[PDB]
Design a protein around this ligand. Structure first.
Ligand SMILES: Cc1cc2nc3c(=O)[nH]c(=O)nc-3n(C[C@H](O)[C@H](O)[C@H](O)COP(=O)(O)O)c2cc1C
Length: 365
């Protein structure tokens, strides 16, 4: 087609000016779980008129975090502190979705109420050799043994997503994204690499999708489908989050979202899928073809790959992470094929409100 990253797009009620999306990225500047003026600056710097942004993963409940200084949206105090970020984005003409993030077993007693065990689909820990939880002192230690949720406690978790989603709207977010990716709580139910349940939430593909289904249904009922994006990564093996067949899992997720869109009358805001980064683009093309709606692809995109993803109909929208970390004006830079600042990995997850956060420079004229 003649569509590109700079073609406008209608994401339901949201009129986007372009297809470049700020991927949700944990940066750990939200000291003590509270959004602050530093996040406001950071998101404002990255906003464009009609540009879509997705927040760093945001706690839906105490115990839902597995990184230091990540924001929450479950408490009044967080809702209020988020306003400044959201106002700052809106002042600059962006839309911002709050990513509702539950890490499940990818946590530590440090991040749990009463230093209790992280919850998950399973009682099995993330394996100890490839993965670590980052603690607030900057150490990396092994993930602990989680406590499998009883089926009876799942509706309370769903309700946390709902309250958090209602809080997000309260704070002024244009909507929310369900973080159902990357081996976190939802993905711990989704993936047969993890989900060793024998009740209604495990076994079949459908059972594995049930938690995500209830989360999405719950959030969609509370705030409206058009304000809900869903993110999944069927083929990302992060935190042991494998599946014997990513394709079919992804199609089950897609199928379930197609079904919810008929059972409810409105489209979701989007399906957001991470690429692992051949066959991979076949998996992505398949999900996008299957999904009746806006498709947001993510993972390893640069401009060129983004332009072709849009041009060739592989995606409506392309989220950028690391490039957006380092390039507040990423969209402009892409538009004029200008220089790209390099990202500094070392300050991805540090705490300074400025350093490695809001101090990556805009283009010179
Ligand atoms: C520092 C960092 C933190 C991230 N945190 C999140 C997150 O909180 N939620 C999420 O869904 N994805 C998260 N991701 C994944 C990104 O949203 C995005 O999928 C990723 O950066 C891949 O695209 P890229 O090559 O453009 O960086 C994170 C990525 C980075 C680099």
């Amino acid at each position: 087609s003649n569509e590109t990253l700079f073609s406008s797009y209608k994401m339901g009620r949201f009129d986007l000016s372009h297809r470049v999306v700020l991927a949700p990225m944990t940066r750990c500047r939200a000291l003590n779980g509270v959004p602050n003026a530093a996040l406001a600056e950071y998101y404002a710097q990255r906003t464009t008129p009609g540009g879509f942004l997705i927040s760093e993963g945001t706690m839906v409940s105490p115990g839902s975090a597995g990184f230091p200084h990540v924001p929450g949206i479950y408490s009044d105090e967080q809702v209020e502190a988020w306003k400044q970020v959201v106002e700052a984005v809106h002042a600059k003409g962006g839309f911002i979705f709050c990513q509702l993030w539950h890490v499940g077993r990818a946590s530590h007693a440090v991040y749990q109420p009463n230093g209790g065990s992280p919850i998950s689909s399973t009682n099995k820990p993330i394996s100890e050799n490839r993965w670590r939880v980052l603690l607030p002192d900057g150490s990396h230690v092994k993930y602990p043994k989680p406590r499998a949720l009883e089926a009876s406690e799942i509706p309370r978790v769903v309700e946390d997503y709902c309250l958090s989603a209602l809080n997000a709207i309260r704070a002024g977010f244009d909507g929310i994204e369900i973080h159902g990716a990357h081996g976190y709580l939802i993905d711990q139910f989704l993936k047969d690499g993890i989900n060793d349940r024998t009740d209604q939430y495990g076994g079949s593909i459908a059972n594995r999708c049930r938690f995500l289904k209830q989360v999405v249904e719950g959030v969609v009922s509370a705030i409206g489908a058009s304000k809900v994006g869903v993110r999944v990564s069927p083929a990302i093996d992060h935190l042991d989050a494998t599946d014997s067949d990513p394709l079919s899992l992804g199609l089950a997720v897609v199928g379930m979202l197609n079904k919810l869109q008929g059972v409810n009358g409105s489209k979701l805001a989007y399906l957001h899928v991470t690429q692992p980064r051949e066959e991979e683009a076949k998996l992505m093309k398949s999900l996008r073809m299957a999904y009746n709606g806006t498709f947001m692809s993510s993972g390893g995109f640069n401009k060129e790959l983004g332009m072709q993803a849009v041009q060739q109909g592989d995606a409506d929208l392309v989220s950028y992470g690391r490039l957006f970390i380092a390039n507040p004006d990423l969209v402009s830079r892409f538009k004029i094929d200008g220089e790209l600042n390099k990202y500094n990995r070392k300050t991805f997850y540090t705490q300074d409100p400025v350093v490695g956060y809001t101090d990556y420079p805009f283009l010179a004229p």
